[PDB]
């Protein structure tokens, strides 16, 4: 891999909007991981998506939590790897800090 790069977006409506308009640029210096936060209805529909290049300290609170807003949950993940944060986390299992199966 060359450098560090993530899908990035601030408060996009869904994964399509986030990824389709994500700039093809490298991460800011002193970031190493790709972060994703997905606010969704518990029934499934996306409400908001934020994706960022981050340091380690932003990746220590992953999982799906209940929102103060009734009927919403917030799922947060992080990953290591070039543009690794293409998907969205939707459940506790995938709302985690992990690598990918690109290279077995
Ligand atoms: C995962 O999230 C979806 C969101 O629609 C939900 O339907 C499902 O109950 C959740 N849990 C599991 C174990 O899949």
From Swiss-Prot:
Subunit structure: Interacts with nicotinic acetylcholine receptors (nAChRs) including CHRNA3, CHRNA4, CHRNA5, CHRNA6, CHRNA7, CHRNB2 and CHRNB4. Interacts (via NxI motif) with LRP6.
All copies of domain UPAR/Ly6, residue ranges: 4-98
Effect of residue 68 to R: Increased binding to LRP6
Domain notes: The UPAR/Ly6 domain is sufficient for inhibiting alpha-3:beta-4 and alpha-7-dependent nAChR currents.
Positions spanned in the full protein: 46 to 141 of 171
Keyword field: Cell membrane, Cell projection, Cytoplasm, Disulfide bond, Glycoprotein, GPI-anchor, Lipoprotein, Membrane, Secreted, Signal, Synapse, Synaptosome
Spans through the membrane: none
Name of the protein this chain belongs to: Ly6/PLAUR domain-containing protein 6
Residues bearing carbohydrate: 91
UniProt note on tissues of expression: Detected in the temporal cortex (at protein level). Ubiquitous. Highly expressed in brain and heart.
GO process terms (BP): positive regulation of canonical Wnt signaling pathway
Keyword Signal included in the entry's annotation: yes
Single GO cellular component term: perikaryon
